[PDB]
Paper text:
There are at least three reported GEFs for Rab11 (3, 11–15); the Rab11 GEF distributed most broadly throughout the eukaryotic kingdom appears to be the multisubunit transport protein particle II (TRAPPII) complex. Yeast TRAPPII comprises 22 subunits encoded by 10 genes, and yeast have two Rab11 paralogs, named Ypt31 and Ypt32. Each of the 11-subunit monomers forms a triangle shape in which the TRAPP core subunits appear to be grasped by tongs composed of the TRAPPII-specific Trs120 and Trs130 subunits. We describe two different conformations of TRAPPII: an open state that allows Rab11 to access the active site chamber and a closed state in which the Trs120 lid encloses the chamber to enable Rab11 activation.
Residue numbers in the entry:
A (entry chain F): 7 to 190
B (entry chain D): 2 to 24, 29 to 151
C (entry chain E): 32 to 64, 88 to 266
D (entry chain G): 2 to 159
E (entry chain H): 2 to 76, 98 to 147, 166 to 219
The structure:
């Protein structure tokens, strides 16, 4: 009924439970630091594992988002982007990414951020400039969650403040809205 | 509160499992001696036992080395429990006795529980003794700070 | 009122991220020894068969996974005093405060922050060691295998309980008592009667035994 | 009162089933009975076939969904979510608006105990041969059954 | 405001779907045929689904009767007087689908004894309990209009589309009085 911005502004202040953002950052940084320090210092096979982590988080977390908000099924990328960029992130991470870089005839979009709480004051060692993204759990969550609402897409970073870009950005390219299953 | 001075639990086969004391160095021997004497006090018709609703019955047995020894037996498990208290620290009130038998019931419950299977890698007797010592620290060496 | 004048993140996402790290530990161990993203595919076990495998794992396997998770928890607890919610606002310093007050801190404020509530009662002997209890223990209040499986539940769960022992065996370190000196083991224990019934079948305990 | 409770998922097979029959709270609660699997398929066929009508003859850009199906004897209340979970319930009359209850059943008794339940799995596909609509592995989450029965016992007034 | 009505002759198969909207005409004719067929399938499949609590004992043949409401229709042909019927009448589809509630509309059913089905789609969500009585009363009214103006007609084969004029221009006034 209400606009999706208000549906999210009126729930973040009313019915949630809250903690410290840089506490959450320290926890995530501890996890990814243990990933880096565990095995062979390799920055390629940590990316896929953080992607997998995010996949499990999102696949288990989508059920909560609908439960608290109760949106309908999303059909087109426009409404999907509006939803996940002005109510979902507002509920979870208290950030409001705005959309940019629509492609031809709306086959994809891109999220852009400058206040990512998954790593705020996390200027990192010089070694990480090639393979480690440090926020791969976010894109894992996006793909895993969106896989559960029947729309199939692949998500991946393009830019990040940490590796020395302007603002961080994620591409969300859709593949096919798979049909619902029939009993037969 | 009542502070037990030594606790001892024995099975049917007269096998000392645990003669734990709270915290002098050489008094552990004296508690061992008194526990064995209390074990001697049991197998006999010198004093009555049970025959009261088929329930266990706490009773004082003897006093030596300046510590009074209370004892208790379980008919349907073979469990033989005995605790000694500092003589000077016991006033002898009815409420005091009502606290002592409650202590006996509690320690019996803890031992019966710890004897159960779960969270035991192999049911090792060393681990069982260690756990029982830990819980007998819990019961009598607690303070409940705010 | 400075406590609430800082940004926040949802306790739901934080709790679930905190939860699925036993799956992280088992997964990283099995990677050490068909979903397409990058034209080479990535496989994964779906975060519950990993639990079931860790339950039916070998002894050395389980010990290694628990050590890894404990290392994670130690990293969580190391930087908790430099965290910018205790350094400035609350009026408890960190000069020395030998024992007692430090455990009051970790027991009262750290648990209120990391988990959703203040602790239940603790116990002390004043010599070296402290006992901590919690009857509900929020981050696992929704785990249950099956109706008449009231034995495998605790076995499957006890890997998760090795994180708060991590923070406890952490924050003592870097504030004055090191890992070799401090030993602490987390274990299960049933709740008292006069508490609501269907929170969890049992409470939980911690056995900090810093040597001094 | 309520006659029975059924949960379905996107893989078109019932997850949880519970019919009370007798008026008592602790009535013949044949929880996850194999006896009523035919009824489960039958009811899912009803709801799926009849959802298409309102899915077709919608207006605007709302893409609506059913709320209730009535008949001579009983009355059906359904909640359908973007996750594909259906929360069908068979009940009687003299309770006119009821969707609040199903939103409650989704809010903090399914996610609180079925999707915050790392021991238990998410929607029970298990790599083909069940996800098409014929196989069956059901939910048996002890907490879910216990708190669900406790919460729904007052609503079986008979 | 009943924005649409339609009918299903005896075994599925639409025969009349004059939709009383201002201007939508989104749904094509062939789609409504499949709609009616699946709706008849829902009636066929709904019978053997009742919960076991009531099947063994009904003890409820007092509520099946429908109360009468005086002037739901207007403000005639074979009938005369102010109104079609006054005596309180009885339900027939004792174990069939009756109502269908959604966010955007509400659909009511009246099943004739022989098998004719009358469907009424209204945008107005009538407290959803008395709405059944209102819908059944109005549906019997249009059913009487049908029995008058569709069957006392030579150029009308049985169970075929209703290509009438008096029927539609009369049910139009019938609905328009009901707002
Ligand atoms: C229409 O139904 C589409 C809904 C949009 C998908 C829901 C996205 C929720 C996940 C947001 C990210 C949460 C934080 C993850 C990192 C810990």
């Amino acid at each position: 009924s209400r606009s999706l911005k208000a549906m999210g502004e009126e729930i973040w202040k009313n019915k949630t439970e809250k903690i410290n953002t840089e506490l959450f950052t320290l926890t995530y940084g501890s996890i990814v630091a243990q990933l880096c320090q565990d095995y062979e210092r390799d920055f390629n096979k940590v990316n896929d594992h953080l992607y997998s982590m995010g996949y499990n988080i999102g696949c288990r977390l989508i059920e909560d988002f609908l439960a608290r908000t109760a949106l309908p099924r999303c059909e087109n990328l426009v409404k999907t982007s509006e939803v996940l960029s002005k109510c979902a992130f507002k509920i979870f991470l208290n950030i409001t990414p705005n959309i940019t870089n629509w492609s031809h005839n709306k086959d994809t979009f891109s999220l852009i951020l400058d206040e990512n709480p998954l790593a705020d004051f996390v200027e990192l060692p010089m070694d990480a400039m090639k393979s480690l993204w440090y926020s791969n759990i976010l894109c894992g969550v996006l793909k895993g969650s969106l896989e559960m609402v029947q729309l199939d897409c692949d998500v991946w970073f393009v830019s990040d403040i940490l590796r020395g870009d302007s603002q961080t950005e994620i591409k969300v390219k859709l593949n096919r809205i798979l049909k619902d299953e029939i009993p037969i | 509160s009542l502070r037990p001075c030594f606790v001892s639990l024995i099975d049917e086969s007269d096998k000392p499992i645990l003669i734990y004391v709270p915290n002098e160095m050489n008094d552990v021997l004296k508690y061992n001696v008194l526990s064995n004497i209390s074990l001697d006090y049991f197998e006999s018709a010198l004093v009555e036992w049970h025959s009261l609703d088929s329930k266990p019955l706490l009773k004082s047995i003897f006093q030596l080395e300046g510590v009074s020894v209370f004892a208790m037996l379980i008919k349907q498990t073979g469990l033989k429990i005995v605790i000694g208290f500092e003589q000077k620290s016991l006033s002898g009130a009815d409420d005091e006795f009502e606290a002592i038998n409650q202590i006996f019931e509690t320690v019996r419950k803890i031992y019966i529980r710890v004897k159960c299977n779960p969270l035991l890698v192999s049911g090792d007797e060393k681990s069982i003794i260690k756990s029982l010592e830990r819980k007998f620290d819990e019961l009598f060496i607690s303070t409940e700070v705010e | 009122i400075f406590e609430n004048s800082l940004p926040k993140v949802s306790q739901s996402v934080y709790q679930m991220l905190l939860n699925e790290m036993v799956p992280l530990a088992m997964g990283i161990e099995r990677q050490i020894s068909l979903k397409i993203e990058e034209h080479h595919t990535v496989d994964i076990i779906r975060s519950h068969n990993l639990i079931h495998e860790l339950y039916k794992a070998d002894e050395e396997e389980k010990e290694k996974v628990l050590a890894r998770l404990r290392n994670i928890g130690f990293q969580i607890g190391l930087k908790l005093s430099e965290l910018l919610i205790f350094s400035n606002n609350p009026n408890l310093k960190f000069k020395e405060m030998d024992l007692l007050l430090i455990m009051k801190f970790i027991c009262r404020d750290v648990w209120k922050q990391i988990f959703g509530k203040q602790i239940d009662n603790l116990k002390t002997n004043h010599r070296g060691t402290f006992y901590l209890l919690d009857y509900d223990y929020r981050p696992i209040q929704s785990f249950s295998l099956e109706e008449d499986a009231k034995n495998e539940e605790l076995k499957m769960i006890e890997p998760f309980l090795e994180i708060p022992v991590g923070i406890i065996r952490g924050v003592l370190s870097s504030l004055g008592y090191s890992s070799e000196e401090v030993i602490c083991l987390a274990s299960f224990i049933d709740r008292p009667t006069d508490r609501p019934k269907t929170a969890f079948p049992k409470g939980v305990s911690f056995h900090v035994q810093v040597t001094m | 009162g309520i006659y029975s409770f059924w949960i379905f998922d996107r893989h078109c097979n019932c997850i949880f089933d519970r019919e009370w029959t007798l008026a008592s709270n602790s009535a013949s609660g044949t929880i996850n009975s194999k006896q009523n699997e035919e009824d489960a398929k039958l009811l899912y066929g009803m709801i799926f076939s009849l959802r298409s009508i309102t899915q077709k003859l919608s207006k605007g850009s709302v893409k609506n969904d059913i709320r209730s199906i009535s008949t001579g004897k009983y009355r059906v209340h359904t909640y359908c979510t973007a996750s594909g979970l259906w929360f069908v319930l068979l009940s009687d009359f003299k309770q006119q608006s009821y969707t609040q209850v199903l939103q409650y059943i989704y809010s903090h008794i399914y996610v609180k105990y079925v999707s915050n339940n790392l021991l238990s799995p998410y929607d029970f596909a298990e790599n083909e041969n069940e996800m098409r609509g014929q196989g069956t592995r059901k939910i048996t989450n002890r907490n879910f059954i216990s708190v669900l029965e406790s919460f729904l016992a007052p609503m079986v007034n008979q | 405001a009943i924005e649409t009505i339609l009918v299903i002759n005896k075994s599925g198969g639409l025969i009349y779907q004059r939709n009383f909207t201002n201007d939508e005409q989104k749904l094509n004719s062939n789609e409504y045929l499949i709609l009616a067929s699946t709706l008849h399938g829902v009636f066929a499949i709904a019978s053997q689904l009742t919960p076991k609590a009531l099947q063994l004992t009904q003890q409820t043949n007092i509520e099946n009767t429908i109360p009468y409401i005086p002037y739901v229709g207007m403000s005639l042909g074979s009938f005369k007087g102010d109104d079609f019927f006054k005596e309180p009448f009885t339900n027939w589809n004792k174990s069939g689908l009756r109502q269908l509630c959604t966010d955007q509309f509400t659909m009511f059913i009246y099943q004739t004894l022989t098998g004719l089905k009358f469907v009424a789609i209204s945008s107005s969500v009538s407290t959803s309990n008395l709405a059944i009585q209102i819908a059944d009363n109005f549906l019997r009214k249009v059913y009487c209009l049908y029995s008058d103006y569709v069957m006392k007609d030579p150029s009308y084969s049985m169970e075929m589309p209703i290509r009438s004029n008096l029927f539609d221009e009369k049910v139009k006034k019938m609905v328009e009085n009901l707002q």
